[PDB]
């Protein structure tokens, strides 16, 4: 039901747990990285082989984000850094410093704006050339995941408190909280249009919220059970489909979960050898990507 040569494709590589693997915005390429301090670039169609490796990072790739140009790659390292890798040549462009802990998550803007959080209880927004944090937000407990709105003024940061913080970069007014969760928010992902937020938390419930200035109270849309988190306190990802009607998630119970956005479970397919850190959908076809802490990444439909 796609252009893939095989319905299921196992990808072998890396020397340790793989923590992130993200599609190119064009849907033609994707990269992967993990505890081996290495980034691997792939080809979605054809022989599905490597065409480059991104060496030089001095830490585990906690997260990475493709650029809209599909020419530069931004990687977040556990060693309190944020490198900019030129995909087509493989040289160091810039290294953004300023954090004080492991940088957990990263996101990119529709405008060259980067955002990140780290265990130093801070959030920093970076210009692609400033090499310094133009804005910094300080919290009381460490932050775990970020989501930037494609429009470019609201950022959603989820951390220990179990409540999503919405920050307006210009306003600096924060008296609006998306309460409802009760434990650590592992990942956040914004819908393609920018109306709905996907949240996953260690309180075992994958929930969905609406992102609008106006609401009819109880902004909580619905919750999904089943996706359970283990005792390793991993950062499990969630994904938005290209049509934003199928929400995806990974669970530490060796399960990949796809929901119909209406509360009905759709996929329960097992197949992983360890906790599945990240899950993603192809922006064009019905491919689903899996990334588990077992040195392997799965292809999908």
């Amino acid at each position: 039901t796609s252009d893939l040569n095989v319905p299921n494709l196992q990808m072998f590589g890396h020397t340790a747990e793989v923590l992130v693997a993200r599609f190119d915005p064009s849907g033609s390429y994707f990269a992967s990285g993990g505890m081996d301090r290495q980034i691997l670039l792939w080809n979605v169609f054809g022989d599905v082989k490597n065409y480059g490796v991104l060496n030089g990072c001095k830490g585990a790739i906690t997260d990475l984000q493709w650029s809209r140009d599909s020419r530069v790659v931004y990687c977040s390292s556990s060693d309190t850094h944020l490198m900019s890798w030129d995909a087509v040549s493989g040289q160091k462009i810039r290294k953004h410093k300023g954090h004080a802990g492991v940088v957990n998550a990263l996101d990119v803007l529709k405008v060259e704006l980067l955002t990140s959080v780290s265990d130093d209880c801070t959030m920093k927004v970076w210009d692609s050339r400033s090499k310094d944090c133009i804005k910094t937000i300080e919290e009381k407990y460490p932050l775990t995941a970020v989501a930037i709105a494609q429009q470019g003024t609201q950022v959603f940061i989820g951390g220990i408190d179990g409540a999503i913080k919405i920050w307006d970069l210009r306003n600096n007014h924060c008296s609006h909280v998306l309460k409802g969760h009760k434990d650590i928010i592992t990942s956040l992902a914004i819908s393609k249009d920018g109306s709905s937020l996907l949240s996953n938390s260690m309180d075992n419930t994958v929930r969905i919220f609406d992102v609008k200035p106006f609401a009819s109270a109880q902004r909580q849309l619905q919750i999904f059970e089943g996706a359970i988190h283990g005792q390793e306190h991993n950062l499990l990802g969630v994904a938005w489909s290209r049509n934003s009607r199928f929400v995806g998630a990974g669970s530490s119970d060796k399960n990949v979960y796809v929901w119909s956005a209406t509360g009905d479970l759709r996929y329960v397919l097992p197949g992983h050898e360890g906790s599945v850190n990240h899950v993603d959908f192809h922006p064009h076809q019905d491919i689903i990507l899996s990334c588990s802490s077992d040195r392997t990444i799965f292809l999908g439909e």
Partner: protein, 155 residues
């Protein structure tokens, strides 16, 4: 189609259709002759009076006796010829009958299988489209509610 409808809706739509309709608005020559004749049945008649066996009379009695004798001789010949071979021809007719019966039923079952396949593909397509339009109208209603509540909330 996929829908839950009562027959009263069908009858109402049919009455609307009837109301709108009200508002808007070879053969040869012998065969034709005999057809205009027997259009009122008028079973054509021919002489079967060759069994009455008219008693001694005029030449007509001689003619009937002679023709009956000739008919009898031909009947003898034909029936003895029939019993020369027995019912082997009848057995062959029944066997060819069952052959054609089976040949027909094979293509009949093939045709119903094809019809069931067309039905199932149709029902699949209608299911996917109808689910899509169902979620569409649900989100339309939610969108209408959101718009009206937002508009009144701005005040």
């Amino acid at each position: 189609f996929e829908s839950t409808y009562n027959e009263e809706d069908r009858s109402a739509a049919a009455q609307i259709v009837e109301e709108e309709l009200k508002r808007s608005g070879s053969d040869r020559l012998e065969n034709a002759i005999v057809a205009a004749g027997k259009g009122e049945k008028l079973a054509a008649i021919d002489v079967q009076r060759y069994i009455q066996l008219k008693p001694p009379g005029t030449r007509e009695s001689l003619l009937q006796s002679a023709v009956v004798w000739e008919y009898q001789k031909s009947r003898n010949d034909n029936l003895y010829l029939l019993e020369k071979h027995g019912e082997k021809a009848f057995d062959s007719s029944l066997e060819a009958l069952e052959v054609q019966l089976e040949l027909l039923e094979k293509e009949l079952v093939n045709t119903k299988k094809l019809s069931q396949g067309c039905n199932r593909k149709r029902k699949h397509y209608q299911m996917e489209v109808g689910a899509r339009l169902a979620e569409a109208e649900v989100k339309f209603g939610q969108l209408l509610q959101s718009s009206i509540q937002c508009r009144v909330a701005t005040l």
